[PDB]
Write a protein that binds this ligand. Structure first.
Ligand SMILES: *[B]([O])([O])[C]([C][C]([C])[C])[N]C(=O)[C]([C]C1=[C][C]=[C][C]=[C]1)[N]C(=O)C1=[C]N=[C][C]=N1
Ligand SMILES: *[B]([O])([O])[C]([C][C]([C])[C])[N]C(=O)[C]([C]C1=[C][C]=[C][C]=[C]1)[N]C(=O)C1=[C]N=[C][C]=N1
Ligand SMILES: *[B]([O])([O])[C]([C][C]([C])[C])[N]C(=O)[C]([C]C1=[C][C]=[C][C]=[C]1)[N]C(=O)C1=[C]N=[C][C]=N1
Ligand SMILES: *[B]([O])([O])[C]([C][C]([C])[C])[N]C(=O)[C]([C]C1=[C][C]=[C][C]=[C]1)[N]C(=O)C1=[C]N=[C][C]=N1
Ligand SMILES: [Cl-]
Ligand SMILES: [Cl-]
Ligand SMILES: [Mg+2]
Ligand SMILES: [Mg+2]
Ligand SMILES: [Mg+2]
Ligand SMILES: [Mg+2]
Lengths: 226, 222, 195, 212, 233, 196, 204, 195, 196
C-alpha cells in the first residue's frame, strides 16, 4: 500500500493507491483507501483493510455526534486523539496505519497514526509497503510554500513511485484535497495508468456448452394472496 | 539461521502444438515486495532445438540450465555429434534434479521442442526430478491461475456441443501457432492482473523444425 | 470411542455402534451401548473423548425429554438435530469444547420418513442416506456407495450393515468387539439382540 | 493415490488412479502410476512421485543387467528384494514410496510383493496402497474370489479404483488397467473417471446417493 | 552459517549513455553502532571495472583479496594482460557469481550483496548483481539493501527501461546518484554523510571520486514542527 | 534516541535528537521528543513512541486537573505522576523518561525515570540508546552552576557525539530552556553540530 | 488444522447485463474424506443472495444468523432488505467478532429492487468489503477462480451467456482443486425471476 | 510388529508369534510368519520397527548358516544367542541402530535340553522358562507365573499357550489376527498348523 | 574489558584494564591483557580469555618462525596472522584484538580486529565492553602526533571513565609503551586514576 499526505499554502492533500492483496494475490484492483471521518477531515489507511475501515467509521461516527453536541465543526486533533487512544488501547492488534488530514477553524493539519497509537506531525508523510518509494520522491521534490497544483502533483507522483516499484501497491491513484475556506474535493481515480489492454480473443461460449442436470424456478417473492 | 533458498517469483508456460512448441515466461524478477529487474530472461535456447526454463529460485534455476547446456555439449563430444532428442533430454534432466534429491534445486522446470516424429513436445518436472510429457503446462507463481484456463481452452475440458446437452463432448481439434500465442498472451495478461509477482514483460520462444524463434510483448509494470 | 455407523433405508434408520471401551492398553468393557434415546422416535449414537461423550448425550437427552413434557409433543428429528448442532456450535468456541461426534437417527411421524443426521464436534450437520464418524467411513462409504439403493428393506439394510462390519473386522487394526445394532421406525426404537 | 493388485485364476490384475497433488492443488490428472519394468514385471507407484519413478526406472536397469548376466529373467522375489534392499540403505533419509512389484514366472507363478520405503517387503494375494487404499479395500474384499474371469476381475479392479477416486480427495483423474498372465502383462486402457462414473452409476445402479 | 558483524549498507548504481556509475558510503557499522567511518566499499579491478560490495566487511575484505589475486593470476604467461586478454567486467562478475553460489551451497555463505559495474571491450555497459544466495540479475539501475527500496525508484525515473539509456548523459546520471545518496542519508539509520562514487566511461575511462559529502540538505522546516499533535509551544 | 536534561544557574535545559526508527528505517527525522506536561515542566521521551506519548498525555491531564484544584504543581510532583504510571504498568511499557522543570522556589530540577519505574533526582541526566556513548564525555565535562551559553554548548557537544555513534539517533538537536524568564525553544542543524 | 480448508468448497459471483449470477460447488469433506455431495453454500433472504465458503459449521451458523436478522429487519422496516444494505449488515456482523472470527468467505449477490442495478460483493473473514464491478471469488480454489474469471469474463453478458461463463469458471477451477467439486449449482438472477441450475461435473 | 511369546517346557521350546501386519490404518496381511530358522535346532522370532526386523533376522540367519557350512557343525543355542546379543549391543551405539527385539528358542543336542533366550534391541540377553516382548508380557507373565510347571509336556505347554492367547484376544486393543505356533525339540522345528 | 592502543609522535602505546569476570564474579582483578607476540609487536585482548590466549600463542609461534627465516616482521604482517586465525575460525571464536607495533620505517601503527575477523588500520583504537562509554570522550580528546606524556594522560583518563561505568572493567590500568628507545611497562592504581 502507498498512502501519502502533503501540506500546501492554503490546505492539505492526501493520496493513495487502490490495490488490496491477500498474500501474492490481488484481492481488489480498485480498492478505496481514502476514508471520510467528517466532511473536511479525511484519512488514508494502510495495513488491515477491515481495521482501517472500522476504526475510521467508529471515530467518524463519534466525531459527528461530538460536532452536534458542541455545535462546532470537528477538529483534526479530535479525530487524531480519538483514533490514537483507541488504537493504543488495543496494543497494535487493530492493524490500522493512518494518515489523518483536514481543515477546521484552527487551520489545516496533517498527521500520521501507527497501529500501536503513536502520532507524528509533518508537512509531508507516507505510510505502507510503498512508503519508501514514495518518501524517496517526497524527499527529492518537496519544498516549503507549495501551491495546490504542486502538492497534488507531488502527492500523486509519490503514489506512482509506490505503484510501479512496490509489489504491494498498484492500479490507480485516489486523491482528496482539503483547502481552507472551501469544500473538500474527493478525486476518486484521479489517475488511471493501469488499464488492461484488449484481450486477443473473446471467450464467450456457445449456448448449451455446459452440461445441466436439473432446472427450477426459485421463489423469491412473499407468500401470495388468494 | 541462514536460509539457502529464496523466491524470485515469475511464471512460465509451455504449450505443445501439432508440429511446433512454445515455451513462454514473464521477464520480471523479484524478492519479497521489490522488483530486481523488469527484463531478466528466464527461457533459454539450450541447443539441439530444445528450449528450457527453470522457474522458482533463480540461483538454482540458472545453475540447472547451465548444467543442462553443459550436458548437451558433452553429449555431442561423447556420442559423435548426435542430436539429443527431447525425450533423452528429459531423462537427463531427471538425473540432474534427483542428483540433488536431499538438497533440491528449488525450481519448477519445463522444456519444450519436437519429438523424433517431428510433433510438438512439452515435458514438465517437479523440483526432485519427477517428469511427464504433456500437451500443456504452466509453472511457477501464477501456475494456479493459468492451468485451469488451459485445461478449458486447450484440452476443451467441461465443454460440450450445443443441442446435445452434456452427451457429446467438444472435439479436440488441434491449435495453430497463432491460436496458441493468443492463449499465451491472454494467460499472462490475466495472471498479471491478479498476481503481484507477474508483469513487466512476456518473452515467448517458439520451436519448429526450422529452428528457435523469439517474440516479446509488454506487460503491466505495477 | 471408536466406530459408529448409520444407514437410512426405505422405512427405517439403522444405527450400529461398537461395544468396546479401551483405556490405554486394556479393553475394560466389551458390551458398551454408545447411544441414548432422545425421544420415542429419535435415537442418538455418539463417539469422541472419554467423559464428554456420555455427559453430552445425557445433557441432550434431558433437554429433549424436558421439551416433550412441557409441550406434550415429540420434536421432529430435524428439530432435534438442529438443537444438537447449535449446542455443539456453541460448544466449539467455549473454554473447553465438547469433543463429541454424533449420529441422530429418527423417524418423522408427520412426514412418515426415516431421517439420518451426521453431526461432528464443530457443529457440522449433514442429512445423509448413510453416515459414519472417525476412521469407519474410510472403509464403509465405498461399500455403501456400491450396494446402497434407497428403496431397501430393513432386512436388506441389516445385510448391507453386516457387510460393512465384516470389512471393518478384516481391515481395521483395533478390535472393537462387534457392534450393537438398533432400528428406528414408525413403531419406535428396538435393539437387534443377535448380530 | 489409490493403487491395487490382486492374484486370481487368470493371473494378476493391477489397477491404479492418475492424480498427483501438492497440498490441495491438483498438479496432474494424467500420471502414469504403473511402470513397465519388462514385458513380465509391473511396478505400481505411490507416495513421492520422483522417488518412485527414479528408483523403479532404476530397478528395470538392474533387472535387465540380471538377465544379461544370468541368461535368465529375474524372479519377482529377486526384483522386489533389489528395490527393498536399496530403499533400506536410504532409510531415515526421507524417501516416500509405496509400491507393488507384480509379475509372473514359471517357478513362482503369479506373484505380488508390497515394497515400502520403511523397508517392509511382503508377499501376498491382495494389496491396496495409497491415501485412498481403504476405499479400494471395501469394494475388493466384498467381491473377491479366486475363480474370477479375466473380464470380471478387470472390472472389479476398475470399480475399486473408481470407489476411491470418488471419496478420496487425493485420488482421481483416470484408471489405468493391466492384466498380468503366463505370457506377460496386457494393457487395458486409460479410463477417465469423469466418464466412467456416470457410466457405472447408470449401468450398475450404484451411487444412488449422488444425483445424475 | 554465520551472522554478519561489521556491515556496509546500500550500494547504488545505474547505466548511462557511455557507461556506468556506482556509489557507496564509507561506513562500517557494528549493529546500531556507527563504528568505522573510513571504509572504502568500491574496489576497482583494472581500469574498466568497479565492484561495489555491501554486507559483511570481513567477507568484503576476503573478496577484495580474491580480486587482487585474480589480476595477478591473469597476468601470468599473458603478454596481452594489459590489452586483448585483460580482465573484463563479465569475467570478474561470473567468477564472483560462481564463488557466491558455491559458498551458499556449502551452507557457509559470503554474507554480501555485490554489484559489478564496468565497461566491456566492445564498449558495452556492464551492470549485474549477485548476493549471498548466488542470485543474479541485471537491470538499468541496481541497488542493494535500503537502496533497492529508495534509490531504485528515483533512478528508475531517469532510466525506466533500456531505450532510456542512450538518452541519459553522465551529468544527469551522476546528479540522480548523488540525490539518491542524500535521500538514503535522510532515511537509512545505518548510513553516513561521506561516500565514494565511481564512473566508468567508455571514452574517459575510470574516474574514482573519494571523500564526497551529502550537501544541500533540507532541515529548516524542523523548527516549525512542535509536539506530536495537540502541543502548541 | 539521545536525550538529556541539565540543570544550571538560571534553571534547566532539556535536549534531544529528532530520530524515530522502525528498525533501520527512519520513520521520522524531525521528531519532537521534548514534550510539555505543564507551563514550566517538560520531559524528554525515549523508548516506545506510543507508550511515552500515552504516558505524557495522561500526565498532562493529571497536572492540568491538579492546577485547577491546588495551583501550580512542583517538578517533584510531576515526576511522581510519571513514576506511578511507569512503575505500576512496568510489564506493559517501554518508556525511558527524563522529567525536568523550573520552580521559583526550587529552581531547576531534573528527575530521570528508567525502564523499571524508579525515580532518580540528579544535577543532570542522560538517556536513550545513544547516551551510552557519552557517559565518559558528560561525566568529564559537566559542572554545576554553569551559564546558559555553557550549558547549551555542553548539551550540543554531548548530543553531537551521541548522534555520531548511535544509528538510532540523528536529525536535528532540539533544546528547551526553562528559566524565570520563560520558555525558549532552540534548534541546531547537522551542518552546525557535526563539525564540532 | 487451517479452519478455512478443512471442509473445502468454492463460491463465485458475476455481473451481467441487467442480471447477476452466483454459483457454488456441493462438496463437504473432512480433509481427504468426502462426506456430502449435497452441501449447498448459496442461501437467499428475499431477493438478496448470499454464498458462503469456509468452515461448514460457521457457514450454517451465519446463514441462520442472517435469516434471523433479515426477518427482524423486514418486520420493522416493512420491506425486504436490499443488497447494498445487506452487505453492510454482513460486514458489521463479521467485524463484531474481530478477535474471534467466523472462518468464512461470504459473497453477496443480487439486484436492487428500486434502481434495478446489479450488485455483487465479497468479504474477508472479518468484514472487509470488496465491492467489485466484474466478479467475486471465494474458497479453496480462489486462485484458480481468479485465473478463470480474469480470462473468461467480459462485461454486459446476457443471462444465458453469463451462465456459460460462470459455469465454466467454476467447473475448471474446481477440477484443479482436491477439496472442491462433487457437483455444482448456478443461480441466474434477474429483476423478477431466478433460475437455479445443477451442473453435471466429474465426481472425484 | 506386535506380539511374540515363548515358553520352554520339559523337552521343547514353543514360540508363538502374531500373524497381523498393520501399517497405519489398515491390516495389510493376516498370515505373516515373524520367525526365521537359524539352524535345524534353533529358531528366532522377532518384533520391532518395520524393515529392520526382517533385515536383521535374515542377516543373523545368513551368518549362522555360514558358520554351519564352514565347520560342518551346528552352534549351540547359547552360542547363537550370544552372537545375536553382540550384534545388537554393537548395533545400539551405531549411526542407525537395529530397532528389533527377538526370542531365540533352541534345543541343545549336546545337553539334551530346550533353551529360550529373550533379547531386546539394546542387547539385553536373559535365559527364561517363558518370555515375551512388547505389551504381551503385561498380560501373559501373570498367567505363566500361575500355571507354568517346569516339567510340562509339549501338549500342556500348548494348552497354557492357548490360555495366554485367549487373554490377549480378550484384553488387548489391537486385533493381532491370531498366532503362528512353532515347536523346537530334539527332532527339529515344526509348525502347529491348527491353532 | 576496556582496551585501547594509541599512536603518537615517538611510537605507540597500548592500554588496558585488569579485570576478568565470570558473570558478576571477578575471577582475576590483576589480569595482564597486554601481551607480547614479538619484541616490539604487542596486542590488547578482549572477549574470551581462552580464545585470545590460544590465538596470541599461535601468532607468537608464527612470528618467531617468520623471524628465524625472513627477519623481523612488520606490524601489518602480525595483524594479518591474527586476522587469518580470527576470520577463518569466526564461528568458534569470541576474540576482539587490537594489534599495535613499532617499526623504525613505519613507526607506530595500530590495527583493530573485531569479532568478524575484519582488519582496520587506525590512528588509535578502542575495544572491549567498556569502550562503548568512551567513544564520545576519545573522539573529542584524541589528537595526532601527541607527546608521550599527553598520550599516557589520554589513555589514563579514557580507561578511567570506561572502568567507572563498565562493571566488566576494573582493577589497575596497565600500559605498554613502544618506541625506538625500547619497551616500557606502566601501571596505574585505583587511588590515582579514580580521582581524575
Ligand atoms: B496495503 O497493502 O497496506 C493494504 C491497505 C488496505 C487498507 C487495503 N493492505 C492490504 O491489502 C491487506 C494486507 C494484509 C494481508 C493479510 C493480513 C493483513 C493485511 N489486505 C487485507 O486486509 C485484505 C486481504 N484480503 C481481503 C480483504 N482485505
Ligand atoms: B499419490 O497420492 O500417493 C500420489 C502418487 C504420485 C506418484 C503422484 N502422490 C502425490 O500426489 C504426491 C503428494 C501426496 C499426496 C498424498 C499422499 C502422498 C503424497 N505428490 C507428488 O509427489 C508431487 C510430485 N510433483 C508435483 C506435485 N506433487
Ligand atoms: B529513540 O530511538 O529511543 C526513540 C524515542 C521515541 C520517543 C521517538 N524511539 C524510537 O524511535 C522507537 C524505536 C526504538 C528505538 C530505540 C529504543 C527503543 C525503541 N520507535 C518507535 O516506537 C516507533 C517507530 N516507528 C513508528 C512508530 N513508533
Ligand atoms: B573482558 O571483560 O572482555 C575480558 C577480556 C579477557 C581477555 C580477560 N573478558 C573476560 O573477562 C571474559 C568474560 C567476558 C566479559 C566481557 C565480554 C566477553 C567475555 N572472561 C573469561 O573468558 C573468563 C572468565 N573466567 C574464567 C576464565 N575466562
Ligand atoms: Cl514521538
Ligand atoms: Cl587472560
Ligand atoms: Mg502484476
Ligand atoms: Mg461431519
Ligand atoms: Mg546517527
Ligand atoms: Mg476436485
Amino acid at each position: 500500500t502507498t498512502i501519502v499526505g502533503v501540506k500546501f499554502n492554503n490546505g492539505v492533500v492526501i493520496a493513495a493507491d487502490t490495490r488490496s492483496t491477500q498474500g501474492p494475490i490481488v484481492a481488489d484492483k480498485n480498492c478505496a483507501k481514502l476514508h471520510r471521518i467528517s466532511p473536511k477531515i479525511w484519512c488514508a489507511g494502510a495495513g488491515t483493510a477491515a481495521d482501517t475501515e472500522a476504526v475510521t467509521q467508529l471515530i467518524g461516527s463519534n466525531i459527528e455526534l461530538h460536532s452536534l453536541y458542541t455545535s462546532r465543526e470537528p477538529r483534526v486533533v479530535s479525530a487524531l486523539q480519538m483514533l490514537k487512544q483507541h488504537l493504543f488501547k488495543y496494543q497494535g492488534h487493530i492493524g490500522a496505519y493512518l494518515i489523518v488530514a483536514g481543515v477546521d477553524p484552527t487551520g489545516s493539519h496533517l498527521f500520521s497514526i501507527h497501529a500501536h497509537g503513536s502520532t507524528d506531525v509533518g508537512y509531508y508523510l507516507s505510510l505502507g509497503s510503498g512508503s519508501l518509494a514514495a518518501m524517496a520522491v517526497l524527499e527529492s521534490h518537496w519544498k516549503q510554500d507549495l501551491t495546490k497544483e504542486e502538492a497534488i502533483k507531488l502527492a500523486s507522483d509519490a503514489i506512482q513511485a509506490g505503484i510501479w516499484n512496490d509489489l504491494g501497491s498498484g492500479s490507480n491513484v485516489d486523491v482528496c484535497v482539503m483547502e481552507i475556506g472551501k469544500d473538500a474535493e474527493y478525486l476518486r481515480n484521479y489517475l488511471t495508468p493501469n488499464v488492461r489492454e484488449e484481450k486477443q480473443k473473446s471467450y464467450k461460449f456457445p449456448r448449451g456448452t455446459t452440461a445441466v442436470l436439473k432446472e427450477s424456478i426459485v421463489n423469491i417473492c412473499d407468500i401470495q394472496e388468494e | 539461521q541462514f536460509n539457502p533458498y529464496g523466491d524470485n517469483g515469475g511464471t512460465i508456460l509451455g504449450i505443445a502444438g501439432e508440429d511446433f512448441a512454445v515455451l513462454a515466461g514473464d521477464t520480471r524478477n523479484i524478492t519479497d515486495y521489490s522488483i530486481n529487474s523488469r527484463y531478466e530472461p528466464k527461457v533459454f535456447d539450450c541447443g539441439d532445438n530444445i528450449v528450457m526454463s527453470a522457474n522458482g529460485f533463480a540461483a538454482d534455476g540458472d545453475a540447472l540450465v547451465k548444467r543442462f547446456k553443459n550436458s548437451v555439449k558433452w553429449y555431442h563430444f561423447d556420442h559423435n555429434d548426435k542430436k539429443l532428442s527431447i525425450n533423452s533430454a528429459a531423462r537427463n534432466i531427471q538425473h540432474l534434479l534427483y542428483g540433488k534429491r536431499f538438497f533440491p534445486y528449488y525450481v519448477h522446470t519445463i522444456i519444450a521442442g519436437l519429438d523424433e516424429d517431428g510433433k510438438g513436445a512439452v515435458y514438465s518436472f517437479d523440483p526432485v526430478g519427477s517428469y511427464e510429457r504433456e500437451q500443456c503446462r504452466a509453472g511457477g507463481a501464477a501456475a494456479s491461475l493459468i492451468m485451469p484456463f488451459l485445461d478449458n481452452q486447450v484440452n476443451f475440458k467441461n465443454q460440450y456441443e450445443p443441442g446435445t446437452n452434456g452427451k457429446v463432448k467438444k472435439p479436440l481439434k488441434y491449435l495453430s501457432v497463432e491460436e496458441v500465442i493468443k492463449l499465451v498472451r491472454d494467460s499472462f495478461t490475466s495472471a498479471t492482473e491478479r498476481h503481484i509477482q507477474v508483469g513487466d514483460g512476456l518473452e515467448i520462444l517458439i520451436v519448429t523444425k526450422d529452428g528457435v524463434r523469439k517474440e516479446f510483448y509488454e506487460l503491466k509494470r505495477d | 470411542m471408536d466406530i459408529i455407523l448409520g444407514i437410512r433405508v426405505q422405512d427405517s434408520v439403522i444405527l450400529a455402534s461398537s461395544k468396546a471401551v479401551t483405556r490405554g492398553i486394556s479393553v475394560l468393557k466389551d458390551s458398551d451401548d454408545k447411544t441414548r434415546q432422545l425421544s420415542p422416535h429419535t435415537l442418538m449414537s455418539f463417539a469422541g473423548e472419554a467423559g464428554d461423550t456420555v455427559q453430552f448425550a445425557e445433557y441432550i437427552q434431558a433437554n429433549i425429554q424436558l421439551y416433550s413434557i412441557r409441550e406434550d409433543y415429540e420434536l421432529s428429528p430435524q428439530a432435534v438435530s438442529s438443537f444438537v448442532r447449535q449446542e455443539l456450535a456453541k460448544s466449539i468456541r467455549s473454554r473447553r469444547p465438547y469433543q463429541v461426534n454424533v449420529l441422530i437417527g429418527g423417524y418423522d411421524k408427520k412426514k412418515n420418513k426415516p431421517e439420518l443426521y451426521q453431526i461432528d464436534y464443530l457443529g457440522t450437520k449433514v442429512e445423509l442416506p448413510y453416515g459414519a464418524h472417525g476412521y469407519s467411513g474410510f472403509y464403509t462409504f465405498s461399500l455403501l456407495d456400491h450396494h446402497y439403493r434407497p428403496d431397501m428393506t430393513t432386512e436388506e439394510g441389516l445385510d448391507l450393515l453386516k457387510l460393512c462390519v465384516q470389512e471393518l473386522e478384516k481391515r481395521m487394526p483395533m478390535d472393537f468387539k462387534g457392534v450393537i445394532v438398533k432400528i428406528v421406525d414408525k413403531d419406535g426404537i428396538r435393539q437387534v439382540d443377535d448380530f | 493415490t489409490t493403487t491395487l493388485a490382486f492374484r486370481f485364476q487368470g493371473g494378476i490384475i493391477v489397477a491404479v488412479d492418475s492424480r498427483a497433488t501438492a497440498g490441495n492443488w491438483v498438479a496432474s490428472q494424467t500420471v502414469k502410476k504403473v511402470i513397465e519394468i519388462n514385458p513380465f514385471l509391473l511396478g505400481t507407484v505411490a507416495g513421492g512421485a520422483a522417488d518412485c519413478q527414479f528408483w523403479e526406472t532404476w530397478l528395470g536397469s538392474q533387472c535387465r543387467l540380471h538377465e544379461l548376466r544370468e541368461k535368465e529373467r529375474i524372479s519377482v522375489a529377486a526384483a522386489s528384494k533389489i528395490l527393498s534392499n536399496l530403499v533400506y540403505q536410504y532409510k531415515g533419509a526421507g524417501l516416500s514410496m509405496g509400491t507393488m512389484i507384480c509379475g509372473y514366472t514359471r517357478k513362482e507363478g503369479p506373484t505380488i510383493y508390497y515394497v515400502d520405503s520403511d523397508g517392509t517387503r511382503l508377499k501376498g494375494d491382495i494389496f491396496c496402497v495409497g491415501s485412498g487404499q481403504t476405499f479400494a479395500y471395501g469394494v475388493l474384499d466384498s467381491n473377491y474370489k479366486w475363480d474370477l474371469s479375466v473380464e470380471d476381475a478387470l472390472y472389479l479392479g476398475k470399480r475399486s479404483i473408481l470407489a476411491a477416486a470418488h471419496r478420496d480427495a487425493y485420488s482421481g483423474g483416470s484408471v489405468n488397467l493391466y492384466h498380468v498372465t503366463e505370457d506377460g502383462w496386457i494393457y487395458h486402457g486409460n479410463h477417465d473417471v469423469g466418464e466412467l462414473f456416470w457410466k457405472v452409476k447408470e449401468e450398475e445402479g450404484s451411487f444412488n446417493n449422488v444425483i445424475g | 552459517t554465520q551472522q554478519p558483524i561489521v556491515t556496509g549498507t546500500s550500494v547504488i548504481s545505474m547505466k548511462y549513455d557511455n557507461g556506468v556509475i556506482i556509489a557507496a558510503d564509507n561506513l562500517g557499522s557494528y549493529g546500531s553502532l556507527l563504528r568505522f567511518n573510513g571504509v572504502e566499499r568500491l574496489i576497482p579491478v583494472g581500469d574498466n571495472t568497479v565492484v561495489g560490495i555491501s554486507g559483511d566487511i570481513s567477507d568484503m575484505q576476503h573478496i577484495e583479496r580474491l580480486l587482487k589475486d585474480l589480476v595477478t593470476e591473469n597476468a601470468y604467461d599473458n603478454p596481452l594482460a594489459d590489452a586483448e586478454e585483460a580482465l573484463e567486467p563479465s569475467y570478474i562478475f561470473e567468477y564472483l557469481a560462481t564463488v557466491m553460489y558455491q559458498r551458499r551451497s556449502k551452507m557457509n555463505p559470503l554474507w554480501n550483496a555485490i554489484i559489478v559495474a564496468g565497461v566491456q571491450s566492445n564498449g558495452d555497459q556492464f551492470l549485474r548483481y549477485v548476493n549471498l544466495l548466488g542470485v543474479t540479475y541485471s537491470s538499468p539501475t541496481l541497488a542493494t539493501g535500503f537502496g533497492a527500496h529508495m534509490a531504485n525508484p528515483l533512478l528508475r525515473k531517469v532510466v525506466d527501461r533500456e531505450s532510456d539509456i542512450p538518452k541519459t548523459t553522465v551529468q544527469v546520471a551522476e546528479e540522480a546518484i548523488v540525490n539518491a545518496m542524500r535521500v538514503l542519508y535522510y532515511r537509512d539509520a545505518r548510513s553516513s554523510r561521506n561516500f565514494s562514487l565511481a564512473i566508468i566511461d567508455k571514452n574517459t575511462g575510470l574516474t574514482f571520486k573519494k571523500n564526497l559529502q551529502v550537501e544541500n540538505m533540507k532541515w529548516d522546516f524542523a523548527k516549525d514542527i512542535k509536539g506530536y499533535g495537540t502541543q502548541k509551544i | 534516541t539521545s536525550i538529556m536534561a541539565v540543570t544550571f544557574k538560571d534553571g534547566v535545559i532539556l535536549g534531544a535528537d529528532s530520530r524515530t526508527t522502525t528498525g533501520a528505517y527512519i520513520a521520522n527525522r524531525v521528531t519532537d521528543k521534548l514534550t510539555r506536561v505543564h507551563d514550566k515542566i517538560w520531559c524528554c521521551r525515549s523508548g516506545s513512541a506510543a507508550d511515552t506519548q500515552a504516558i505524557a498525555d495522561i500526565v498532562q491531564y493529571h497536572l492540568e486537573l491538579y492546577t485547577s484544584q491546588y495551583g501550580t504543581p512542583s517538578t517533584e510532583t510531576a515526576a511522581s505522576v510519571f513514576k506511578e504510571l511507569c512503575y505500576e504498568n512496568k510489564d506493559n511499557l517501554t518508556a525511558g523518561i527524563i522529567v525536568a522543570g523550573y520552580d521559583d522556589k526550587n529552581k531547576g530540577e531534573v528527575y530521570t525515570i528508567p525502564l523499571g519505574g524508579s525515580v532518580h533526582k540528579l544535577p543532570y541526566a542522560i538517556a536513550g540508546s545513544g547516551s551510552t556513548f557519552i557517559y565518559g564525555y558528560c561525566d568529564k565535562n559537566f559542572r554545576e552552576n554553569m551559564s546558559k551559553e555553557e550549558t547549551v554548548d555542553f548539551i550540543k557537544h554531548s548530543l553531537s557525539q551521541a548522534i555520531k555513534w548511535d544509528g538510532s539517533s540523528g536529525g536535528v538537536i532540539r533544546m528547551v530552556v526553562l528559566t524565570a524568564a520563560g520558555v525558549e525553544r532552540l534548534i541546531f542543524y547537522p551542518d552546525e553540530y557535526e563539525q564540532l | 488444522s487451517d479452519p478455512s480448508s478443512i471442509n473445502g468448497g468454492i463460491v463465485v459471483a458475476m455481473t451481467g447485463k441487467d442480471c447477476v449470477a452466483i454459483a457454488c460447488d456441493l462438496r463437504l469433506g473432512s480433509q481427504s474424506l468426502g462426506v456430502s455431495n449435497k452441501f449447498e453454500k448459496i442461501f437467499h433472504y428475499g431477493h438478496v443472495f448470499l454464498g458462503i465458503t469456509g468452515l461448514a459449521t460457521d457457514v450454517t451458523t451465519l446463514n441462520e444468523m442472517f435469516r434471523y436478522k433479515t426477518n427482524l429487519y423486514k418486520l420493522k422496516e416493512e420491506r425486504a432488505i436490499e443488497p447494498e444494505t445487506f452487505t453492510q449488515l454482513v460486514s458489521s456482523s463479521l467485524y463484531e467478532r474481530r478477535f474471534g472470527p467466523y472462518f468464512v468467505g461470504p459473497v453477496v449477490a443480487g439486484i436492487n429492487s428500486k434502481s434495478g442495478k446489479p450488485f455483487i460483493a465479497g468479504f474477508d473473514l472479518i468484514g472487509c468489503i470488496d465491492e467489485a464491478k466484474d466478479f467475486i471469488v471465494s474458497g479453496t480454489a480462489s486462485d484458480q477462480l481468479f485465473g478463470m474469471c480474469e480470462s473468461l469474463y467480459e462485461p454486459n453478458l446476457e443471462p444465458e451467456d453469463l451462465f456459460e461463463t460462470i459455469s465454466q469458471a467454476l467447473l475448471n477451477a474446481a477440477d484443479r482443486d482436491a477439496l472442491s467439486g462433487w457437483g455444482a449449482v448456478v443461480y441466474i438472477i434477474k429483476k423478477d425471476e431466478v433460475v437455479k441450475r445443477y451442473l453435471k461435473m466429474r465426481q472425484d
